[PDB]
């Protein structure tokens with residue numbers, strides 16, 4: 001689990017896990033004047049890791065303003081940082097630049113400017129990222145197609161080396177959908193994750209206020225990624241504002257992996273309030289957040305919704321039906337497999353509303369609603385402040401009745417001897433007497 005936010009006043013977060021046992025974290029800073037870096041042996045450890053400024057804007061000329069969206073990568077034995085910058089003479093003539101270091105430790109190492117990443121068209125360009133698919137290193141970025149009436153579109157190309165493209169780019173997406181064109185018509189911040197022989201390219205769209213969101217392109221890993229036809233654009237955002245969890249304009253993401261390498265992690269920013277004083281680019285309050293990516297049965301990523309601040313929620317699977325998870329539908333709790341609306345199946349364990357060391361299970365998509373029983377049936381319902389609700393929504397965490405070491409069971413606080421259990425897939429609180437009953441009342445958290 002993660003505790004969000006990871007880092008206040010850091011936008012466009014990029015985290016890179018290296019072979020040296022460390023995660024490396026860079027981001028845009030509010031002053032847009034430099035490139036910072038920190039490292040930690042764990043993702044959660046990044047929150048208190050100290051920053052080094054590795055590079056500062058030039059006093060005059062190119063690379064002299066709007067230092068935006070650095071990414072750090074390790075390629076062929078060296079570190080590379082990809083970033084965007086305008087000039088002191090023209091602060092909005094943003095182009096893509098690369099730094100290189102041969103040092104083992106990029107925090108203390110010295111950096112060489114490898115210059116601007118040249119592109120056929122001379123126009124507003126930013127958010128360069130690099131990734132390898134089917135043995136081939138690509139660059140993807142955001143750039144103004146001058147012949148289009150918008151801010152930026154998405155481009156992809158092969159690479160000759162980490163600072164030079166080979167051959168010609170392909171435009172693979174342009175901002176045309178209603179949710180891509182709020183305030184400004186933008187596709188930016190491309191980021192690539194691969195799973196099960198498919199490649200997913202997420203990207204950010206609309207202005208950087210509450211309307212900011214993620215879209216996605218999908219392709220096969222064996223396809224020609226430079227053929228625009230290889231890519232399918234999602235019709236609706238794959239990640240967007242949740243008023244319910246108080247998370248606004250989520251976007252400019254990257255992807256990393258958990259400590260064991262077994263879980264993909266979505267790294268992104270948002271704000272915890274909706275309305276912004278003045279111009280969003282002068283608002284410094286975007287913060288970096290982390291949440292696990294869950295993979296749908298159909299092989300596509302499920303980002304759910306931007307989770308509430310604090311500890312991340314978890315999913316509970318059944319002991320005897322390992323692929324079925326506790327979820328709500330029309331607010332009734334049940335176990336079910338292949339949950340498409342992911343957040344219906346996410347809950348966080350919090351101190352019990354009735355105290356005495358009990359626990360309560362708060363809904364991820366309906367904060368302040370909890371798993372609670374009424375007439376021995378389990379629903380997800382809003383805490384109304386009543387004593388009755390507290391008691392109905394509080395449980396004593398027990399070791400699993402069919403698996404004591406790794407399993408979990410939930411004994412009702414106000415009805416001792418009754419456990420949360422599934423029956424005909426619906427959740428209830430009932431006494432437990434048989435071997436099967438004990439299995440029906442045992443669950444796993446994050447398994």
Ligand SMILES: OC[C@@H]1O[C@@H](OC[C@@H]2O[C@@H](O)[C@H](O)[C@H]2O)[C@H](O)[C@H]1O
Nearest residue numbers: 328329330331332341343344365380
């Ligand atoms: O559990 C609350 C909520 O119910 C599910 O949506 C209900 C669904 O909405 C209409 O389209 C249908 O009439 C009704 O069945 C959500 O998945 C869950 O969040």
Ligand SMILES: OC[C@@H]1O[C@@H](O)[C@H](O)[C@H]1O
Nearest residue numbers: 151152184186206207208
């Ligand atoms: O930093 C993002 C850029 O700034 C604004 O012009 C638009 O939101 C986008 O093109």
Ligand SMILES: OC[C@@H]1O[C@@H](O)[C@H](O)[C@H]1O
Nearest residue numbers: 320422423424425426440
């Ligand atoms: O919930 C599915 C099954 O329904 C009942 O027949 C069993 O107790 C339970 O395992």
Ligand SMILES: [Cl-]
Nearest residue numbers: 338339340341
């Ligand atoms: Cl569903």
Ligand code: NA
Nearest residue numbers: 127129189190
């Ligand atoms: Na990026």
